[PDB]
Design a protein around this ligand. Structure first.
Ligand SMILES: *C(=O)[C@@H](N)Cc1ccccc1
Lengths: 134, 427
RNA sequence: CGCCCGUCGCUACUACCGAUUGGAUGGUUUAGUGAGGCCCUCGGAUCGGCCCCGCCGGGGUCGGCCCACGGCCCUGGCGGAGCGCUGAGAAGACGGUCGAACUUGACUAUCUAGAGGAAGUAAAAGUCGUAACAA
RNA sequence: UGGCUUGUGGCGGCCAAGCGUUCAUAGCGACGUCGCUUUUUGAUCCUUCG
RNA sequence: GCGGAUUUAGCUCAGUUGGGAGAGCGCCGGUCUCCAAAACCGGAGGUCCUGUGUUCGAUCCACAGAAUUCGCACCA
RNA sequence: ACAUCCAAGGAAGGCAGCAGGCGCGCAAAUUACCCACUCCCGACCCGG
RNA sequence: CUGUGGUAAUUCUAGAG
RNA sequence: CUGCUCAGUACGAGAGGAA
RNA sequence: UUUUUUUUUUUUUUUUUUUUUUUUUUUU
């Protein structure tokens, strides 16, 4: 009963072995991405580049490199809807957000951790269906 | 006391800004200490003779070059009227600015140099006495006073023969434009000396007409169409500490009050009036003729620009998917066909527009069709044509709101044609 | 006719190394300098009261028919007006502790530029050899 | 060092087929030919090792 | 607002001094195959971004627009 | 250390108090009405 | 607190009762 | 050599810019 | 008392892109 401190100290230190716990523990989340841990960042379409799918899946994926506002850093982004390219023009303000928990992109996608959802401060769904905007 | 908008027009260097500045001065609207400082600054930069002009010309490039570049607005008050006076540039590069000025005007002072060669140049084929007169007519200015300027100049020296020469030339041309020439004052002045600006000049005994101020009082105020729907073409948009983003422009039709919700077309952005100002005096309402700045809550400066038009939400300004017009061709070096794309200067806007069809050539005097779908038009022709603006443009039918329904066509920096819109297909 | 390995040639992205004694940033600071208030040795623009003398006005007593007059006590006005003594009292000023800020460097914490060098990872297949799985 | 000579170097020159959009010379000139030059370099052995 | 660049084939770029364009991918097409890869044929493909001026003639020059870029100005 | 207007001489300021502008960003309002309530502050009222 | 004052200008402020 | 007036002038369609 | 047993590799590196298809009670 008098050896409480060792178990107390032991737990916290052995705990370091949990990588997600570790992630919160080290100021890394703030600095591991262009966002700074942020869910959404406004950006500019520097170029639009077609890319090739990975493994047996064969496809041309719509990809945009984006210059961020406060951050000012290069970003690799994924264009989502079918003919969004028709509606994506260079240097139009774009809001970007991530896919399924931070880390790995959709298995089909190559090196993109980010998704494009707004064009000119307008959501994607509106351009995509005829009834909304044009 | 009724309010009027005055545009000052005419060829480069003919004396527009010197007239306005000097007029404001001897009318005591300008601090003598400031005139003193301007003069010293003008002399020290090698430009003594710009002291009155520099009351209006404030931009770094205006002062460096000694020319006006864009509009300046000044309030002054005569015996009968309060005027907003608008100083417009003569330089050919900035006739687009002069045109927005004319679109906002009730009357015009045409300033024309009597100096040898200066007159002839202004009235030459590619001169801006010629061009500004033409554009003022098309933007719907009927009341005009002409200041035959620089009578003091040594190569002029108050000569009545020179004066009557410029008057007659000016008269023959102005009558060909449709001006009622018998009614318009031709005052011999010196913008620089002051002759005939506000008091009568001993140097020119032979002149019996009004002085310029007297001529102003003899003008007549225009119809105030307060029962037509609100339309305010924006001439510029400022971003102002305390107010936020404030469009400026002249109320053409309708009325605007603090509290109002307003929409700006063609963007489709909506805001709400926090405040209204004319010549630094805060207002609660503004009616046609009011030249104003209006602060707008909920609108970013980047959303709105010059040539956009503000109306109330229930009757928003019309955006033309396409539009139809009656046009006359002033000048063209070859021919105009379907597909021709000059810029359209309408109210404060200027947007290239493609001629998608030429429905009919008309006899310029009678208006009868002389040929269905002509193969082309040329200089001298009149026509009914269809127009598709290259980017979203606001226009109204001339029959409905004439101040958003008259236009010039310009291309390669020349005025090519003039027009009135006879029909609009809304976006 | 199964799996499978590594160097070598493209293309991209990370991180390691790095001539510039490298640049940038923010915290604690050694030393040399020191505004400014404040305590404190002074000073002393200035102001008033009593000191002495002479002259008149007024109240109360004494020597005079007086009246002026003289003495005491209390005020008013003028000269030696400040000439003798006292009190509070602005500028300034001795020497201080406090201590901004300047410079000169330190030092951490936090990023970062670069010819080149060196891995990897996307990695499907081009090119060399058979290492591992069945002694 | 100096020196003859000037191939080599440097510079002008007659002629004008060409450039120069029309045209040769405004401004330039193939080829071909006449030369001036002695701060390059070259060949020569004349002056200087007493 | 002003001023510079840039716009040429499906893609990316070269030309030019007004007589009218040229290459690397592409890629695309066919044969073989489940489909490609390889192999073997075959493909030619452009209002030279637009209007006007000049000109006998404008991809080119001049003057004017658009779109993208980059300087600079303005500052309710 | 910021930084506002300079009659060229000077004079100011500390909105991390309401409103309101900008900025910053992924991220938070309006230049309103009032002492009636709750209290509090000044002296024997009833001011603020 | 009366009145009398100066300055581009500031919470400037004299002298007199 | 530079400045002030000469002068934003004449000459220019402007860009510009003198003596 | 009853058993070995020699032989030994003389010669076998490599094989371009892509590969594929699955789901249930209740009796008439
Ligand atoms: C804001 O000042 C307007 N109301 C007046 C104005 C100033 C500058 C430019 C345009 C308008």
């Amino acid at each position: 009963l008098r050896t409480a401190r060792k178990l107390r100290s032991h737990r916290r230190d052995q705990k370091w072995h949990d990588k997600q716990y570790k992630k919160a523990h080290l100021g890394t989340a703030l600095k591991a991405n262009p966002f700074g841990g942020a869910s959404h960042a406004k950006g500019i379409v520097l170029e639009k580049v077609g890319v090739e799918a990975k493994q047996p899946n064969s496809a041309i994926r719509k990809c945009v490199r984006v210059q961020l506002i406060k951050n000012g850093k290069k970003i690799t982004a994924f264009v989502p809807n079918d003919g969004c390219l028709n509606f994506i023009e260079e240097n139009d303000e774009v809001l970007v957000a991530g896919f399924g928990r931070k880390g790995h992109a959709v298995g089909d996608i190559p090196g993109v951790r980010f998704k494009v959802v707004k064009v000119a401060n307008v959501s994607l769904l509106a351009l995509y269906k005829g009834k909304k905007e044009r | 006391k009724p309010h009027m908008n005055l545009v000052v027009i005419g060829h480069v260097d003919h004396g527009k800004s010197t007239l306005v500045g000097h007029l404001l001065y001897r009318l005591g609207y300008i601090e003598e200490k400031k005139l003193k400082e301007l003069e010293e600054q003008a002399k020290s930069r090698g430009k003594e003779s710009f002291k009155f002009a520099w009351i209006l010309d404030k931009m770094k490039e205006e002062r460096e070059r000694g020319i006006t570049i864009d509009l300046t607005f000044m309030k002054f008050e005569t015996k009968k009227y309060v005027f907003t006076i608008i100083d417009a540039p003569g330089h050919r590069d900035f006739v687009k600015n002069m045109i927005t000025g004319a679109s906002q005007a009730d009357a015009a002072i045409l300033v024309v140099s009597a100096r040898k060669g200066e007159f002839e140049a202004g009235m030459s084929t590619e001169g801006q006495t010629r061009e500004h007169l033409l554009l003022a007519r098309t933007m719907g200015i009927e009341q005009i006073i002409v200041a035959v300027n620089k009578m003091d100049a040594p190569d002029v020296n108050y000569d009545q023969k020179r004066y009557e020469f410029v008057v007659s030339v000016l008269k023959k041309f102005m009558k060909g434009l449709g001006y009622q020439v018998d009614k318009i004052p031709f005052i011999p002045v010196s913008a620089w000396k002051g002759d005939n600006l506000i008091e009568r000049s001993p140097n020119m005994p032979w002149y019996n007409g009004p002085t310029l101020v007297e001529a102003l009082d003899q003008l007549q105020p225009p119809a105030k169409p307060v029962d037509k729907p609100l339309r305010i073409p924006v001439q510029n948009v400022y971003s102002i500490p305390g107010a936020g983003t404030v469009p400026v422009g002249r109320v053409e039709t309708g009325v605007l009050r603090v509290g109002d919700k307003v929409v700006f077309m063609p963007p489709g952005v909506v805001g709400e009036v926090r405040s209204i100002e004319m010549h630094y005096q805060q207002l609660q309402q503004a009616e046609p003729g009011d030249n104003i700045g209006f602060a707008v809550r909920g609108v970013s400066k980047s959303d709105i620009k010059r040539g956009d038009v503000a109306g109330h939400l229930d009757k928003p300004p019309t955006v033309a998917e396409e539009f139809e017009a009656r046009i006359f061709v002033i000048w063209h070096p070859s021919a105009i066909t379907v597909g021709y794309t000059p810029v359209i200067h309408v109210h404060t806007a200027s947007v290239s527009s493609r001629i998608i069809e030429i429905k009919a050539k008309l006899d310029p005097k009678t208006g009868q069709v002389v040929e269905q779908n002509p193969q082309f038009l040329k200089a001298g022709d009149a026509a009914i044509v269809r127009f598709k603006p290259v980017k979203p443009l606001v226009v109204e039918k001339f029959s409905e709101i004439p101040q958003l329904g008259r236009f010039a066509m310009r291309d390669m920096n020349r005025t090519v044609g003039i027009g009135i819109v006879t029909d609009v297909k809304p976006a």
